[PDB]
Amino acid sequence: EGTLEVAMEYRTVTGVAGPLVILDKVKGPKYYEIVNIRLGDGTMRRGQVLEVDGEKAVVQVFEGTSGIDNKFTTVQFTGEVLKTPVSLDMLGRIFNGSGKPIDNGPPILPEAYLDISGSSINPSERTYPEEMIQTGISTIDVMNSIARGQKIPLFSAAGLPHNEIAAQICRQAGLVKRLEKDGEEDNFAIVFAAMGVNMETAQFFKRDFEENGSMERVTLFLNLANDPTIERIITPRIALTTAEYLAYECGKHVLVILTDMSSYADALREVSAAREEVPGRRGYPGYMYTDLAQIYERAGRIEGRKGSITQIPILTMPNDDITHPTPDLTGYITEGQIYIDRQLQNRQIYPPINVLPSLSRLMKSAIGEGMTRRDHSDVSNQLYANYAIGKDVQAMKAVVGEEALSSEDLLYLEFLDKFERKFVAQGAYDSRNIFQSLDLAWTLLRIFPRELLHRIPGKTLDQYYSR
Amino acid sequence: YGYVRKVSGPVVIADGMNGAAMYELVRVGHDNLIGEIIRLEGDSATIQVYEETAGLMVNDPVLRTHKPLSVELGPGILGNIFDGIQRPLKTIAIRSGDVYIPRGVSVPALDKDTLWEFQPKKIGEGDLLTGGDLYATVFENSLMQHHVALPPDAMGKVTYVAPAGQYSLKDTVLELEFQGVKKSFTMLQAWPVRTPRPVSSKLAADTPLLTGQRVLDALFPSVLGGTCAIPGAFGCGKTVISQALSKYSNSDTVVYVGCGERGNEMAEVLMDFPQLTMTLPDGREESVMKRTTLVANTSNMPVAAREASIYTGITIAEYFRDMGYNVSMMADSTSRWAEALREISGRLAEMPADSGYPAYLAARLASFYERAGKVKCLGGPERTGSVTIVGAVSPPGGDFSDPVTSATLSIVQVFWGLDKKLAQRKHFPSVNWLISYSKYSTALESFYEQFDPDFINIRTKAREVLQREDDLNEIVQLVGKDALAEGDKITLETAKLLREDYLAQNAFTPYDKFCPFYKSVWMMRNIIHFYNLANQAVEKGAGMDGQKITYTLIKHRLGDLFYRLVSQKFEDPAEGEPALVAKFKKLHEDLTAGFRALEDETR
Amino acid sequence: QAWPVRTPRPVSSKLAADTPLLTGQRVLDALFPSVLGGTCAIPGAFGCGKTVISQALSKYSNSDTVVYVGCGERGNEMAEVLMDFPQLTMTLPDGREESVMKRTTLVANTSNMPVAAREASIYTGITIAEYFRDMGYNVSMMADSTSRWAEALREISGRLAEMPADSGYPAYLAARLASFYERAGKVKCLGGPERTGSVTIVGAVSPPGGDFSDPVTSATLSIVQVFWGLDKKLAQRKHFPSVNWLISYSKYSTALESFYEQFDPDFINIRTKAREVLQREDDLNEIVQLVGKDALAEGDKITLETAKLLREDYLAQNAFTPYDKFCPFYKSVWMMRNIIHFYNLANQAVEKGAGMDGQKITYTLIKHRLGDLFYRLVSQKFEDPAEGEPALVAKFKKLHEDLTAGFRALEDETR
Amino acid sequence: LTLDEAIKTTNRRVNALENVVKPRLENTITYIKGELDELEREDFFRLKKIQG
């Protein structure tokens, strides 16, 4: 830090196509060098250097390419990668896609600058999800529960209220250990990143968080659909960096809500097409898996610090499918999957969660004696078995006829109806405790006879069958 | 020496190489990110970064190491955690207190300074020695005897052999003379990550793997030093089957090389390696960390590391098999490895063949999966080890025609195809008994004959019963159970008995945690014997009764035996093999008494 | 004044819209309503003639101004519009005759016109809509056949050798279409006085082959708030609106709750009940097709009844007859209330009828003895709106009360 | 009664099950081929032209 150097300033813009500008005769161009673009009109745009070769350097532009010309476009090379400012003061504020504040307030007075896509954590220093949290949703809390540091993506399609359930989860987020849990450190410090969302959904989320009373806790990063596409590829990275600082270097539990991963994949595809690389599945860039892994693996508990990051990236199935590359890779990476079913929506259940495909890989470790009753796993296994047998029985009754169905067949159909009616359905502003919720699950289970409950061990049966 | 010209993610062009070697490791930039050459074009070269590449500059120096990728083989590798670049992660975390892994860190794979005892095997001065001769042994820990051996490309006469003593890795202990030159030697030896270790001869496998799971051990047996294929599903398998290999497997050592996976799962399992000791030795409780080595590269790891980690793991496995120890290699990768090949092909602008996968995917998979077998080692004394490969593929939910799956099933001999429906059915083993198959069946004929000659026929009968149940499930779904006959009734009863008692192993309970082969064979024998007795009873059908009437009668009259056949699962293996064998023999005798008194009563 | 067409005209602020768009068509007005300034999408596969719906909206919406733009639209349609709008009159509170042609501007260029101009056409249309929005008026724009715009993007991008991301459509399709749809909304205008105008966008995404999995349809459904699903089944049956209830959905239902409550609290409950009845009707149709007409429950019979009545009367409008040309909201609410109240009376009769026979089994006999009232229920749609609000409301009160009295007396009879 | 039920089941199968599944298979084949194969070949050709 003896002496510094002022950034260069070039005018050699030999080609402008799409969201990219092709500089030339540039010397010493760093990779991912952050550039500031001064147009002929004087307005300043910021962009990134996607590729470096010889004296050439392909520069992507965040704010679009609607004013650049050879004669008067001047570009500077700051000689550094993106480093968003971060501090504790960043809380309770709303920011644009690139992190520029839009809360009509002042810019962030940084505590420090953190390079985006923060340093890789030594795997020998991570820790498994230790504690579990109460999500308020009966379907989420009782089965496929969410532990601190888990990666649970919600899978939805167009029209399904993924935004509404995301807002519900944000208000209902809470600890559960023995139903015990100021908790300012325990405050979830929700980081919400919305990419390519309709302005109506943006105002919806803004009002929902403003009325929630957590405006001193939550932090919103917005990249609307009308906003430039390139900005959307940085917004979740900025959110991850802010969460990492506020969690690790600030000692606060942090929950992350990433919105519309399909929109992020769209920006990735746009960038790849503009750069003209070899496609992957469905024309997507071949490295989309690496990008999603880097955007997902930045969460989890850490041994050396008291903080933790738990992320709930809502995902939009494009054609209401899973073979699409984005949901497929997300399932490959994320340790969970929550399904919102169009069939449930057709019957007008406000939480449409389809419990059958829902699963949490760390659910077994999440549930504990302190976290839940000792028979919670038995309840979950029994509910899976009963639902699967009931679906098979419903198909059999449909093919053979309603009358031809056996007595246990009608019992399974009644269980399905009562379950999908009372259990899955829940109110919109109503949260709920875990232990009596498990009691109600036992009510649904004791609807079936003791003999049929082969999945539940006899010990837990005697423990909680009669009640 | 050379300087960068083009930077595009993992691909970094370096002009000025001129004479450079294909796959020669080269350090790039001031941080010296280690990378390998993938494409020569003349003076220029193409280097995969093997690290984060942001922040490079044109004219940044590039240095040639002149040597292909190699992993340091020597004492002290067991119970350690390595990235695909062979970096001791715990050592990095300790030396540098920062929780992160610093960019371009250069730490030796094994600590030279650390001391280790020595024990020569009566080696004499002037003796002619050859590559792979187990001249000495070192106890890295209890129950682990690292027998240091001469490098495969090394032989001569022993001018000097060190006396037994405490030595650091940098220390020399053995001196050889050959062709009028003197070659010193340390414990650590370097071997290329490709080009498998030399083998005197490849041998036909003879002994099964004998895993804890019942279906894996009986229905789809796997020999020692043989390939395996699992679809890498969650909840079980990579958690359950892997745990069974880790603590319940007869393999001496496990090389877990998971790559391209969920990070939290590996965090938990790494937290589990020091714990979860298994008392396999008679007098000591073998902590599994002693008999395991983790090659961990999470999803955030660089793409080239995903390709490198598999070969590092198989090199370690070949090393262990050189000493004669039987070692298992579980690989959660080869699912994301194909993705890494796709990425590197896309950056290199190669033309894909099918669905975007580069063509040589099949060839590389064939090489890696054929790098395993029962091998007679080099040198003296004559010894034999094996390497068993268990590699994951795409999850069972997707189509099994995926190119990676198709390539694997071409070469792999045992596919333990898990079922999504079974997983949703909460059937924990989740192994499908229809798609799965084990081509190793013919080899184990002698083993099964010497163990129990009747086991083959009862296994075939169980397979036939399962096939009949699966076949007529469609019929009963369509037509209905009304037309089902007495033979069909007993067939369905036996099929349900199998699905509940036999194929289901919770493994979360002491009675179900591990199922020895003696208990598995007895349970199958009991089920098949009950099926045979029911068949004979319904076949008799005399005395103005029998057939379906006999089936209902034995269902009610002999309901106690049918009920306790299910409880036969709950019989605790820890009680001891003689006691369990006696109990099962008594149960078989009672079953013979059943359907015999029922034969006497003539319904 | 000249405005860069691509750039979006500035707004002081964007505010939530809470004024429903009164289409004048019962199905869209009630089942899947839209707010003023909202964003809508009409697939309208080949042969459905969505343009009649668009023209009906242009004629009878409550908008202050109409900006009709057709990209790829056939020339005859624009002739028809220009020849028929001037004669057609709309009645303001003053009541004087006035031509919607004054209220409407046409930006359309026919299919014969060069394809490169599709973008320019759509952007000029939307910027003219925005200009009228800044004036304080509430304007609605209809974008005929944006699929032609997508094809124009594909053709232009194809020449540039830009890589085809999906089915020839370039990667930057969702972005542009999203911007186009996002220029819509309800905003507080700039300057003084404090105008509050809006722009309503109701585009059209014609599915090639009639498969909604098409890329343009996929992106639209992704970024659209209210969606009206046209189907070939109803079009073939000459239903006329051809608005399938199942696929169509409105995300604006929550917002218009206040307006519905102040107008009529019954509307929410009757709307939900009608949706449930339609879903049950579809399920029962599937079950019967699987099994057969026989073994059909009397309660299921009552459910399928009056659901057939819904489909035949309330969900269908002729759109070319004086009575069905424009459906006022109040009479739509009355018809829906009549249908649901008949259904509820049937449920009550099933609950108690002095034995299971008279309760539900005799639903056929109830239909026989209530045939005149059921015919009045099915014919309530036939009346013209020219009778005036008092006449229609009095007639609907009389119909509802007569139906209730007759049903109760017949339910009282033999019970 | 049994013959009526069986005949109804068989006729329903022949008239609905196959008559719906066969169009499903045809649509799946048409979509799979005419989208995936066509667009993959087009992408490969465009890349080849780019290199050329």
**CA A128 to CA B239: how far, in whole Å?**
14
Q: Is A260 within 8 Å of A314 (Cβ atoms)?
A: yes
What distances in angstroms separate CA B519 from CA A429, B297, B522, B577, one per listed residue? 55, 38, 5, 8
Chain breaks in chain D (C to N over 2.5 A) after: none
Nearest CA to B418 among B576, B215, B172? B215
Beta carbons within 8 Å of B523's beta carbon, 6+ residues apart: B214, B501, B502, B568, B569, B584
Token pair for residue A202? 């943006």
**Interstrand relation of A336-340 and A20-23 (parallel, antiparallel or unpaired):** unpaired
What distances in angstroms separate CA B300 from CA A119, A294, B186, D29, one per listed residue? 10, 5, 35, 37
Token pair for residue B58? 């044109």
Look up residue C72 and give its DSSP letter.
S
* A312 residue type, one letter: I
**CA B57 to CA A259: how far, in whole Å?**
35
Beta carbons within 8 Å of C228's beta carbon, 6+ residues apart: C28, C32, C40, C41, C42, C243, C248
Which neighbouring-strand residues pair with B73? B189
Answer whether the bond into residue B381 is a cis peptide, omega within 30°: yes
> How many CA atoms within 13 Å lie on the side-chain side of B493?
24
**Interstrand relation of A74-77 and A8-10 (parallel, antiparallel or unpaired):** antiparallel
Convert B281-331 into a string of H (helix), E (strand) and C (coil). Answer: CCCCCECCCCCEEEECECCCCCHHHHHHHHHHHHHHHHHHHHCCCEEEEEE
Nearest CA to A336 among A363, A354, A356, A300? A363
**DSSP assignment of A99-165:** S-B-SSSPPP--SEEEESSPPPBPGGGB-----BEE-S-HHHHHSS--BTT-B-PEEE-TTS-HHHH
Q: Using DSSP, how many helices (H) and how many strands (E) does chain D show?
A: 3, 0
Kindly tell me the sign of the dihedral angle through the C-alpha atoms of C208, C213, C216, C220: positive
* C58 residue type, one letter: S
**CA C269 to CA B435: how far, in whole Å?**
52
**CA B202 to CA B321: how far, in whole Å?**
12
Q: Is D31 on the interface with B (CB under 8 A)?
A: no
Helix B577-593 with B517-540: angle, nearest 10 deg: 0
Beta carbons within 8 Å of A182's beta carbon, 6+ residues apart: none
**DSSP assignment of C275-312:** HHHHHHHHHHHHHHHHH-SSS--HHHHHHHTTHHHIII
To the question of whether residue C45 is assigned a binding role by annotation, the answer is yes
Beta carbons within 8 Å of A10's beta carbon, 6+ residues apart: A23, A25, A26, A74, A75, A76, A77
Residue that is written with structure tokens 């405006």 in the block: A215
**CA C131 to CA B335: how far, in whole Å?**
55
* A277 residue type, one letter: E
Q: Is A354 within 8 Å of A339 (Cβ atoms)?
A: yes
Chain D: touching chains (3 or more CB pairs < 8 Å):
A, B, C
**CA B548 to CA B528: how far, in whole Å?**
19
CA distance A270 to chain C (A): 5
Asked if A318 and C16 come within 8 Å (Cβ–Cβ), the reply is no
Token pair for residue A323? 């073979």
**CA C327 to CA C380: how far, in whole Å?**
12
Token pair for residue C325? 């040309």
To the question of whether residue C200 is assigned a binding role by annotation, the answer is no
Beta carbons within 8 Å of B441's beta carbon, 6+ residues apart: B221
Q: Is A396 within 8 Å of A202 (Cβ atoms)?
A: no
Nearest CA to B426 among A98, A178, A387? A387
Report chain A's C-alpha Rg in angstroms.
25
**CA A148 to CA A254: how far, in whole Å?**
9
**CA C207 to CA C147: how far, in whole Å?**
8
Q: Is B85 within 8 Å of B126 (Cβ atoms)?
A: no
**CA B292 to CA B270: how far, in whole Å?**
11
Asked if A198 and C276 come within 8 Å (Cβ–Cβ), the reply is no
**CA A51 to CA B10: how far, in whole Å?**
11
CB contacts < 8 A (A, B):
180
Look up residue C112 and give its DSSP letter.
T
> What's the N-to-C CA distance of chain B in angstroms?
95
**Cβ neighbours of C204 (radius 10 Å):** 27
> How many CA atoms within 13 Å lie on the side-chain side of B163?
0
Q: Is B212 within 8 Å of B507 (Cβ atoms)?
A: yes
**CA A190 to CA A242: how far, in whole Å?**
11
Asked if B264 and A298 come within 8 Å (Cβ–Cβ), the reply is no
D in contact with B (at least 3 C-beta pairs within 8 A): yes
Nearest CA to B257 among B386, B428, B388? B388
Helix (H) or strand (E) holding A37: strand A34-38
Kindly tell me the sign of the dihedral angle through the C-alpha atoms of B276, B280, B284, B288: negative
Give the nearest partner residue to A283 out of D5, D43, D50, using CB atoms. Answer: D43
Q: Is B450 on the interface with A (CB under 8 A)?
A: no
Look up residue B412 and give its DSSP letter.
-
**CA B289 to CA B291: how far, in whole Å?**
5
**CA B162 to CA B160: how far, in whole Å?**
7
**CA B572 to CA B452: how far, in whole Å?**
22
Phi, psi of B145 (to 5 degrees): -110, 95
Q: Which residue of A has its CA nearest to C222?
A: A158
Look up residue C230 and give its DSSP letter.
B
Phi, psi of B63 (to 5 degrees): -115, 145
What distances in angstroms separate CA C164 from CA A38, A459, B436, one per listed residue? 32, 61, 41
Answer whether the bond into residue B302 is a cis peptide, omega within 30°: no
Phi, psi of A443 (to 5 degrees): -60, -50
Residue that is written with structure tokens 């880790």 in the block: B246
Token pair for residue C402? 């007569």
What is the torsion angle, in degrees rounded to the nearest 10, for the CA atoms of residue A410, residue A414, residue A419 and residue A422?
Answer: 180
> What's the N-to-C CA distance of chain A in angstroms?
71
**CA B376 to CA C175: how far, in whole Å?**
63
**DSSP assignment of C237-262:** TT-SS-B-TTT-EETTTTTTHHHHHH
Q: Ramachandran region of residue B164, left (φ > 0), alpha (ψ -120 to 50) or beta?
A: beta
Token pair for residue B178? 């050959």
Q: Which residue of C has its CA nearest to D12?
A: C290
**Interstrand relation of A83-86 and B45-48 (parallel, antiparallel or unpaired):** unpaired
Residue that is written with structure tokens 């709309």 in the block: C90
CA distance A158 to chain B (A): 23
Q: Which of residues 321-350 of B touch D (CB under 8 A)?
A: 349
**Chain A residues in contact with D40 (beta carbon < 8 A):** 279
**Chain A residues in contact with C182 (beta carbon < 8 A):** 198-199, 224-226
Kindly tell me the sign of the dihedral angle through the C-alpha atoms of A221, A223, A224, A225: negative
Asked if A319 and C218 come within 8 Å (Cβ–Cβ), the reply is yes
Helix C50-60 with C75-84: angle, nearest 10 deg: 30
**CA A51 to CA A59: how far, in whole Å?**
7
Question: DSSP 3-state helix, strand, coil percentages of chain D (rounded to 5)?
Answer: 95, 0, 5
Give the nearest partner residue to D35 out of C167, C289, C292, using CB atoms. Answer: C167
Q: Which residue of D has its CA nearest to A277?
A: D47
Token pair for residue C108? 């359309």
* C61 residue type, one letter: S
